[PDB]
Write an enzyme that holds these catalytic residues in place. Sequence first.
Site, short mmCIF file in Angstrom:
data_model
loop_
_atom_site.label_atom_id
_atom_site.label_comp_id
_atom_site.label_asym_id
_atom_site.label_seq_id
_atom_site.Cartn_x
_atom_site.Cartn_y
_atom_site.Cartn_z
N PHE A 224 36.30 63.67 47.30
CA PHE A 224 36.07 62.34 47.76
C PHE A 224 36.73 61.28 46.91
O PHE A 224 37.46 60.46 47.43
CB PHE A 224 34.58 62.11 47.85
CG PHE A 224 34.03 62.23 49.25
CD1 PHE A 224 34.61 61.52 50.31
CD2 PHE A 224 32.86 62.96 49.48
CE1 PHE A 224 34.04 61.53 51.56
CE2 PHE A 224 32.29 62.97 50.73
CZ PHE A 224 32.88 62.25 51.77
N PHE A 225 36.50 61.33 45.60
CA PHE A 225 37.04 60.33 44.64
C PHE A 225 38.55 60.45 44.38
O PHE A 225 39.26 59.43 44.30
CB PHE A 225 36.21 60.30 43.36
CG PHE A 225 34.83 59.75 43.58
CD1 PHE A 225 33.83 60.54 44.14
CD2 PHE A 225 34.57 58.39 43.37
CE1 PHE A 225 32.62 59.98 44.51
CE2 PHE A 225 33.32 57.81 43.75
CZ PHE A 225 32.36 58.60 44.32
N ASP B 54 40.20 58.93 47.36
CA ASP B 54 40.05 57.47 47.33
C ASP B 54 41.08 56.76 46.42
O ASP B 54 41.52 55.63 46.71
CB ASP B 54 38.60 57.10 46.93
CG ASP B 54 38.26 55.61 47.19
OD1 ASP B 54 38.76 54.98 48.15
OD2 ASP B 54 37.43 55.06 46.44
N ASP C 17 44.43 53.06 46.03
CA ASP C 17 44.27 51.96 45.09
C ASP C 17 45.65 51.33 44.93
O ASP C 17 45.75 50.15 44.61
CB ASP C 17 43.72 52.45 43.76
CG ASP C 17 42.21 52.57 43.78
OD1 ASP C 17 41.51 51.56 44.08
OD2 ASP C 17 41.73 53.68 43.50
N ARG D 271 44.90 43.34 55.49
CA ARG D 271 45.87 42.77 54.54
C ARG D 271 45.73 43.65 53.30
O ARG D 271 45.19 44.77 53.39
CB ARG D 271 45.68 41.25 54.23
CG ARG D 271 46.63 40.31 54.99
CD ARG D 271 46.85 40.78 56.44
NE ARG D 271 48.18 41.38 56.66
CZ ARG D 271 48.49 42.69 56.64
NH1 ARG D 271 47.59 43.63 56.43
NH2 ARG D 271 49.75 43.06 56.87
N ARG E 263 33.09 48.99 56.48
CA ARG E 263 32.59 49.78 55.36
C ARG E 263 31.77 51.04 55.69
O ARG E 263 31.83 52.02 54.95
CB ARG E 263 31.79 48.87 54.42
CG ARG E 263 32.61 48.31 53.28
CD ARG E 263 32.52 49.16 51.99
NE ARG E 263 33.31 50.39 52.02
CZ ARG E 263 33.30 51.32 51.06
NH1 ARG E 263 32.53 51.18 49.99
NH2 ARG E 263 34.08 52.40 51.16
N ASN F 94 25.87 50.83 45.91
CA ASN F 94 27.25 50.99 45.45
C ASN F 94 27.86 49.62 45.09
O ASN F 94 28.30 49.43 43.97
CB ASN F 94 28.03 51.63 46.59
CG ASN F 94 29.42 51.97 46.21
OD1 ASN F 94 29.70 53.09 45.82
ND2 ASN F 94 30.32 51.00 46.36
N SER G 275 28.89 48.44 40.97
CA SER G 275 30.26 48.15 40.53
C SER G 275 30.67 46.68 40.59
O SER G 275 31.87 46.36 40.61
CB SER G 275 31.27 49.00 41.32
OG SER G 275 31.40 48.61 42.69
N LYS H 50 33.21 45.24 37.77
CA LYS H 50 34.53 45.84 37.75
C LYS H 50 35.49 45.26 38.81
O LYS H 50 36.59 44.84 38.45
CB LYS H 50 34.44 47.36 37.88
CG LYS H 50 35.59 48.05 37.17
CD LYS H 50 35.68 49.54 37.44
CE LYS H 50 36.79 50.16 36.57
NZ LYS H 50 37.11 51.57 36.89
N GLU H 51 35.09 45.20 40.08
CA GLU H 51 35.95 44.65 41.15
C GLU H 51 36.14 43.13 41.05
O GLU H 51 37.07 42.57 41.65
CB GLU H 51 35.42 45.01 42.53
CG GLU H 51 35.46 46.51 42.87
CD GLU H 51 34.91 46.85 44.26
OE1 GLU H 51 34.14 46.03 44.82
OE2 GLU H 51 35.25 47.94 44.78
N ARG I 145 39.10 41.97 38.73
CA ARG I 145 40.42 42.17 39.36
C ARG I 145 40.67 41.28 40.59
O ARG I 145 41.68 41.46 41.29
CB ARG I 145 40.66 43.65 39.69
CG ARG I 145 39.48 44.39 40.30
CD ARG I 145 39.73 45.91 40.33
NE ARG I 145 40.31 46.40 39.08
CZ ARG I 145 40.00 47.55 38.48
NH1 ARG I 145 39.10 48.37 39.01
NH2 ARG I 145 40.62 47.91 37.36
N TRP J 152 21.33 58.59 40.54
CA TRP J 152 22.67 58.74 39.96
C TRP J 152 23.16 57.44 39.34
O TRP J 152 23.58 57.44 38.20
CB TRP J 152 23.65 59.15 41.02
CG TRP J 152 24.96 59.50 40.47
CD1 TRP J 152 25.24 60.56 39.65
CD2 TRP J 152 26.21 58.87 40.77
NE1 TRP J 152 26.61 60.64 39.45
CE2 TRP J 152 27.22 59.62 40.13
CE3 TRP J 152 26.56 57.76 41.54
CZ2 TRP J 152 28.58 59.29 40.23
CZ3 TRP J 152 27.91 57.42 41.64
CH2 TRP J 152 28.91 58.20 40.99
N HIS J 153 23.13 56.35 40.09
CA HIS J 153 23.55 55.08 39.52
C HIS J 153 22.64 54.67 38.34
O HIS J 153 22.81 53.59 37.79
CB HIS J 153 23.58 53.98 40.57
CG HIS J 153 24.82 54.00 41.41
ND1 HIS J 153 24.78 53.93 42.79
CD2 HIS J 153 26.13 54.06 41.07
CE1 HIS J 153 26.01 53.93 43.27
NE2 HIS J 153 26.85 54.01 42.24
#
Length: 304
Positions: free
Chosen positions: A74-75, A78, A82, A155, A164, A210, A214, A217-218, A221, A299-300
């Site tokens: 999965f990761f 993904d 990027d 875009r 999503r 989710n 995160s 982090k996003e 950027r 998990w998180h």
Amino acid sequence: QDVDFHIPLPGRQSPDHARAEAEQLAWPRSLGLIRSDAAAERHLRGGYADLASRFYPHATGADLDLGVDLMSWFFLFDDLFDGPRGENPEDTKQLTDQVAAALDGPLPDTAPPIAHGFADIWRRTCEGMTPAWCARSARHWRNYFDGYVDEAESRSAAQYLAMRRHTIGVQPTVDLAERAGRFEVPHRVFDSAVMSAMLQIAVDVNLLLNDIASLEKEEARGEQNNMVMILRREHGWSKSRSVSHMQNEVRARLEQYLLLESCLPKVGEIYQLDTAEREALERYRTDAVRTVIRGSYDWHRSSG
């Protein structure tokens, strides 16, 4: 990491997890998905075998491995979006199609490794299950893929959630809980308005958890396609009112999840489920839908 939530379900995790986290690398390596040692270690620290072991608490041995592998794939998959490839509907599709091709028959040796990896997984997801189950899973995978394509196209919260819900990977995740468990919910009940409502809550809750985890982090950027960022836009809210409101949305979804769960016995009557069926549906509720909801939250709270 660590933001409070209302999740009244029993935390569980597979007794075979350590051995699973230990042998994690042999698979992605032998398929060329990880070549160097620093990439292996960059992998170990995402903590994917841990997550597998909470989504699939009921699994063991090779059945648990299949889940670990799905989580890895999965990761890894993904990552490939990027890059610049992620903003051009045609390079995405270009790739998508080579992976999705595996659902229809054998892949040419010249296919990328991320596509041979997927095929190894699917060859194992389906073997032993029924044709109809298999076909229902494949239908889910194809929307997953098309989810990525309709994303590259770009875009509004209701519009964001819309796209999503496919790219998140929840449904094929839950499907794997059946395979690992070696059972299958009655197909007629799976199609029910009540169960699909429970499934839509599992999905929604996952991307809200989710998106909160995160956040920092996003942000650094410049990404504006995050629930928090979008919620300040549509409503004109402070970044803290956007986060509380999400905790609320979760809380209210979890409340309702429970409401729906109580309508399940009556739903089994409506579909005149027999003894075995009534049980497969119980397993599905506790071993597939619940675990995907709770497993992510637990998990998180440490890994990834």
